[PDB]
Each structure stands twice: as C-alpha cells, then as structure tokens.
Scaffold this active site. Structure first.
Site, PDB file in Angstrom:
ATOM      1  CE  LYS A  76      50.259  44.468  46.913  1.00 31.67           C
ATOM      2  NZ  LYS A  76      51.656  43.336  46.848  1.00 31.67           N
ATOM      3  NE  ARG A  89      47.360  38.164  49.970  1.00 39.22           N
ATOM      4  CZ  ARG A  89      47.190  39.565  50.256  1.00 39.22           C
ATOM      5  NH1 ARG A  89      47.470  40.436  49.639  1.00 39.22           N
ATOM      6  NH2 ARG A  89      47.053  39.834  51.472  1.00 39.22           N
TER       7      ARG A  89
END
Lengths: 243, 212
Positions: free
Chosen positions: A189, A223
C-alpha cells in the site's frame, strides 16, 4: 485464544496469525492460488462482478481445501458466491448496499466489516473507528447475523492519510475490546510506498515489517500479496510470542 | 540518546543500521553500497580499510577486534567505535544472568577510565545460546533498557532464523528482518546486519509506527 471462525462445516483456527493470499486467465489464477497455498496461506481473497468472481470461486472450491473469501458489496454476489463455496464475505462497504445485509444474513457466512471514511481528517481516529464498528456490529446482529460471525478490518489506506495509517498500526491492539478477530491489509500500500518511495513490487520488505508489527499486536488475519515471505515472518513472530 | 566520536554525533532516537564489513577496491565498493543503502555505521588487514573509509566517507566506523595495537591504530586511522566480542565501546555476551554479565563489565570500564555514557550493550545473540535462549532474549528484550545504555542487536542470518525456517543462510533475509523489527519495536537502537537495504526499509516502518 480460542478465537476461530466457522463456515461450511469447517473451523478456521485464529489462535495464531493466519495469512490470506490476494487473488485478482482462469488457469493462471488457479496456478497463482496453488502457489499461495504451497507458500502457506490459509485463505484466499478473490476480488473483482458475478461473471468475473463466481467462476473462480467455483473453480477454487472444486480443487482446493482452503478458505475462500470474496470481496464484494453486491447482494447478488454475496448470494451466488455462497452457493459456489465461499467461506467468508469481505465487504469494503460493510453491507450498506441495498439488500447486502439481508443476503449476508441468509448465507450464514462470516462477514468482515471494514472501516472507511477529499483529504482525510479525524478528530480522533481510534474513537471514530470504534464508534463505526459498535454501530455496524449492532446493525449486523439486529439483522440476525450473530456477533460470533463478525470480523473487523480497520481499513488501512481507506480514507486515511499516512499519519493516520501509522497511528492506527501503533494503536491496533485497542480494537481487541470487541472480542472479534481483526483482519488487516497493508500489503504494497501507499502507506509503505509513500515512506519508502518505491514502486509496488519493491514494497515487499516494508509490507512484511507492517505485518510483523500487526501480528505482534494480536491481529488474527493478515491479507497480503507476498505470501511466502509473510508466512516466514509470522513463524518468527509465533516463536517470540511462545517464548 | 546520542553518541559522539571524532566530531560526529550518532543519534539513537531512531533505529540505526550497522553494516557488516569483515581486494581493497572490493571493500570500498561494498561500503559505498551499504552507505547508499542507508547504513549509518560500517562495522569492520583491517586498518587500511579504516583509513580509506576515513577518507572516502563521513560515516561511523566500527571495528570488531580484541588486540590493543589494532584498537589504537584503528583509533588513529579514523575509527569511531570499538566493538569486541578514547572511543566508545560495545560490551558483548537467562534474563537475570544477562544483567549480571553486564552489571560486572560496566564496573571494570567505569573503574578503568571509560565513561558510562561511552558504553553500548549487545546481548550477544547466537553466542552460547540455543533456539529457546535466542527467542526468549528477543521476547524480553525490553528489560535491558533499564541500565539506560544504547542497545546493539545482531541476529542477521544467525541459526535462530536458519533453524525455525530450515533455510540456507542466503535465504534468511526475511526472518532476520522480522527479528530486526521485533527488536526495534522494543526500542533496540542499533541493528547489525548483512542485509542493509532491506533492514533500512524495515526500520523506516518501525520509526513511523513508533513516532505515531
């Protein structure tokens, strides 16, 4: 913990951190899934809708023993994915779409709720996250979805700036007061990329260091894109926490 | 906390990454790699390296040695830190036992003209320790902060990663980094590693978490 989830007659043991692999041609997907399983993921998250998502669920269900998670907001997709063999419904919109809460209740499947909020701003980020989850957990229970079916995802990157994502990662253990499993997704991210200034395929080390921090605070499900590295890190974390 | 040597200040408020550098051209080129990778220390027959490095770079120079002559000549060459298994020195080396070895050796140094602020503590990972001894030392690493001295940790590509994961040493980068994160989250200030670039990246995630 005795924290666990139940789906399709199966138990998912959340006593130790579980790695969820990200799956986003049909045969390439199944080869990628097999690789993530061999790497040690215990969940595979399939993201899209019905004609892209549903067949890969069907295909995965036929061939693998592993929990299948489908990220959708659409009542239709929730329903069909259940018929196809999905174990877990992951919704960015926390079942707020028309019919979504009802369709989810009917399936009896576990449901992951995700906090989300234009530049992001919070008077106090953790207070807002808590209020958001207290509210939506009540809404699920009122709909017939038992509290024991719920998972919380504090939604890294979703309506959160860089300082917010790290504050939430530093205070992440505070969300345990709900007594529900935490699922977190930090992999590749911008919270890693804006600190390191590298392209996404070079964010593997930073993403793993976030996974280690979150696991040290008890997050149950991680995740990630890079399963094998995150699995090895979680063995290091499990060994320290058993020392 | 900070350290000071040869006009240079080493800031220990945030984790620093120490490069391992144990043919002259090769070393200088390897060091340039680590410095570009973001190491702020390079830990180092040995003396012409200290000298070249002294000239090439302003980075902190450590040296791993136990001879008085190689100590003093390095010190002359432009060396900043003396690490052994008037510069700052790093002590090396079940919790209570950790403390005693360390209680003792601060005495010797204090009584012998080396200031207490000049000392660093390395708990000696993988030196006379098994799988459980290494992991319990990591789990309880927070304790040793009480002595109020900076911590040097060095678990890079040790057995304690090899044995859990069953991986050849080149394949221990992931697990050493994970150990570096768990140590740095507990406040260890200096991380001794082969894998500078990867460790530096991981120490940025840690500093940002700790800063928040």
């Amino acid at each position: 913990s005795h924290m666990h989830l139940t789906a399709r007659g199966l138990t998912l043991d959340l006593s130790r951190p579980q790695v969820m692999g990200i799956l986003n041609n049909l045969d390439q997907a199944l080869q990628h899934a097999q690789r993530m399983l061999s790497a040690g993921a215990t969940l595979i998250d399939i993201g899209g809708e019905l004609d892209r998502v549903v067949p890969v669920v069907e295909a995965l269900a036929q061939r693998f023993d592993v929990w299948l998670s489908v990220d959708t907001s659409k009542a239709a997709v929730i329903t069909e994915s259940a018929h196809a063999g999905a174990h877990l419904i992951n919704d960015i919109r926390s079942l707020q779409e028309p019919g979504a809460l009802e369709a989810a209740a009917k399936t009896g499947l576990p449901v992951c709720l995700m906090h989300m909020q234009h530049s992001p701003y919070y008077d106090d980020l953790m207070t807002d996250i808590n209020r958001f989850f207290q509210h939506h957990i009540e809404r699920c229970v009122a709909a017939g979805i038992a509290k024991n079916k719920l998972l919380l995802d504090p939604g890294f990157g979703f309506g959160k700036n860089l300082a917010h994502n790290y504050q939430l990662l530093a205070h992440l253990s505070e969300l345990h007061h709900f007594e529900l499993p935490l699922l977190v997704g930090m992999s590749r991210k911008s919270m890693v990329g804006q600190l390191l200034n590298v392209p996404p395929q070079q964010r593997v080390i930073g993403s793993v260091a976030c996974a280690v921090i979150a696991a040290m605070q008890g997050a149950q499900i991680i995740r990630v894109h890079d399963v094998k590295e995150t699995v090895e890190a979680m063995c290091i974390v499990e060994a320290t926490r058993s020392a």
